[PDB]
Amino acid sequence: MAIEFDIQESKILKGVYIITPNKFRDLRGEIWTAFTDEYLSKLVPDGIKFKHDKFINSHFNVLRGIHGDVKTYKLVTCVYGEVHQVVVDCRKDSPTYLKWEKFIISYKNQQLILLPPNMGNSHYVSSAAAVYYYKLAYEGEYMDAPDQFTYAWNDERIGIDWPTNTPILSDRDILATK
Amino acid sequence: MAIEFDIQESKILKGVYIITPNKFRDLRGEIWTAFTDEYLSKLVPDGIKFKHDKFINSHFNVLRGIHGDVKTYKLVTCVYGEVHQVVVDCRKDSPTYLKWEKFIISYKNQQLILLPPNMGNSHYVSSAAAVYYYKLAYEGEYMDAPDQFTYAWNDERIGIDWPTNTPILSDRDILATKN
Ligand SMILES: Nc1nc2c(ncn2[C@@H]2O[C@H](COP(=O)(O)OP(=O)(O)O)[C@@H](O)[C@H]2O)c(=O)[nH]1
Ligand SMILES: Nc1nc2c(ncn2[C@@H]2O[C@H](COP(=O)(O)OP(=O)(O)O)[C@@H](O)[C@H]2O)c(=O)[nH]1
Ligand code: NA
């Protein structure tokens, strides 16, 4: 069995890609490739490389977002449990500014979503716990919270269908709701 | 909170590094960085880039190994559950050829292990289930199972301390024990 990626662009959000890796399944579990440069480099303009891997461990009913920055391409997935992954178009000059798309990523939908910069990254944890993996590609220093923009998870102008009105939020994600 | 790494070289096997990231902890859980080019690329010779990310989900009692190849640098960890990660020195020219070191890796002990080429990689799943993450750095094409070596998980010459006599194995990891 060889390493394969099914790739298609979102039908809702221009420049968002849905990457589906194949998996080797046996008695022991599964092996899969989330990323090679060879297959997924072309999703990102010349010079810009994926150079940064993060794991985010969250409990049930946690919502992180909506976070973006001006320079970071993100490849996001859930490698344990289940997240309602939601991308918002936060490009103010996009014909789909503040449109959104949900990807419910779990054991039975192992997708990686590619966000270009100026997009809203968010996830809600619908499992008991979830491990969120994401690769970042940017030039220069990491955009930490102070260099990032924030929209409210429940911003009326976005209207994301979340499975709860009452998520567990950081102070940053609460401040965005005022 | 700045992204940070504690980097230490094994006391047992020259060229094996133990990487410990810091974690942001809050009401929601934890955020941590497993890898940046800026901090970890200097572990690998100039030229060779980490360019391949893999995930292995395994049941309790699964043992995968001992697998290596002549060109692949690996950065390995467990991002859910718990594994006995065992590194073996399989460099026939090293004075610790067939010496081994164990790391029991979990959220509570988040070590990433850097393996140079010609080293034996293995892990056993001690938890209900485990997600094993590993970055590969290599020149050119992936070394698949035909381009790999395999040492028997229980090879007498290594004598690894495993928490079981009867792990769940692949055909090739079973062959190793009889061949
Ligand atoms: N789809 C996919 N299959 C893989 C990958 N890596 C290995 N395989 C397949 O899984 C099978 C077992 O590979 P092996 O290297 O023996 O696995 P291990 O025993 O878990 O280290 C072989 O057919 C491989 O071709 C991967 O990243 N993606
Ligand atoms: N140690 C460490 N801290 C981080 C990392 N990423 C973010 N942080 C810190 O965690 C906190 C929350 O960051 P934020 O981007 O709002 O996280 P989010 O709400 O999960 O998207 C801030 O204090 C960051 O500095 C990391 O990779 N390692
Ligand atoms: Na034993």
B24: contact with A, CB 8 A cutoff: no
Nearest ligand to residue B26 Cα: 2
Residue pair B21/B128 in contact (Cβ under 8 Å)? The answer is: no
Helix (H, G, I), strand (E, B) or coil at B11: coil
Number of domains in chain B: 1
Active-site residues of A, by number, are: 67, 134
CA B123/CA B162 separation, integer angstroms: 10
Residue A58 sits at the chain B interface (C-beta within 8 Å): yes
| CA distances to B101, B105, B151, B153, B177 from B159, in Å | 11, 20, 11, 9, 13
For the beta sheet containing A129-137, the strands, ordered from the edge strand earlier in sequence to the opposite edge, are A5-9, A17-21, A112-115, A73-80, A129-137, A50-59, B29-36, B23-26
Chain B residues in contact with A124 by the CB 8 A cut-off are none
Both ends of chain B: CA-CA distance in Å? 51
Residues 6+ apart with CB under 8 A from B69: B117, B118, B143, B147, B148, B149
Closest CA to B158 of B117, B122, B111, B113: B122
The secondary structure element, H or E, covering residue B175 is helix B171-178
Q: Describe the strand order of the beta sheet including B63-68 as a list of residue ranges.
A: B100-105, B83-89, B119-125, B63-68, B149-150
Query: CA dihedral defined by A4, A34, A77, A80, rounded to 10 degrees?
Result: 110
Q: How far apart are the first and last CA of chain A?
A: 52
A–B CB contacts, 8 A cutoff, strictly below? 99
Active site residue B84: no
Catalytic entry in B124, B132, B134, B138: B134
- What is the nearest CA distance from B99 to chain A, expressed in angstroms? 27
Instruction: Write out the residue range of the structural domain in which residue B93 sits.
Output: 1-179
The answer, yes or no, to whether the previous bond of A66 is cis (omega within 30 of 0) is: yes
List helix spans (H) across chain A.
37-40, 171-175
Say if CB B75 and CB B50 are below 8 A apart: yes
Residue of B nearest to A36 (CA): B52
What lies within 8 Å, CB to CB, of B178 at 6+ separation is none
Q: How far does the CA of residue A20 sit from the closest CA of chain B (Å)?
A: 14
Q: Which residue of B has its CA nearest to A26?
A: B170
Rounded Cα–Cα distance for residues A53 and B35 (Å): 5
Residue B3 touches partner A, C-beta closer than 8 Å: yes
Sign of CA dihedral B86, A133, A59, A27: negative
Helix (H) or strand (E) holding A24, with range, is strand A24-26
Nearest to A79 among B27, B38, B55 (CB): B55
Q: What are phi and psi of A110, to 5 degrees?
A: -90, 70
Question: How far is residue B50's CA from residue B29's CA, in Å, rounded to a whole number?
Answer: 28
| Candidate from B28, B52, B64 with C-beta closest to A59 | B28
Cross-strand bridge partners of residue B5: B21
Please tell me whether the peptide bond between B66 and the residue prior to it is cis, using omega within 30 degrees of 0.
yes
The Cα–Cα gap between A67 and A88 comes to 9
Distance, in Å, from the CA atom of A42 to the CA atom of A46, rounded to the nearest integer, reads 8
Token pair, residue A125, equals 């944890």
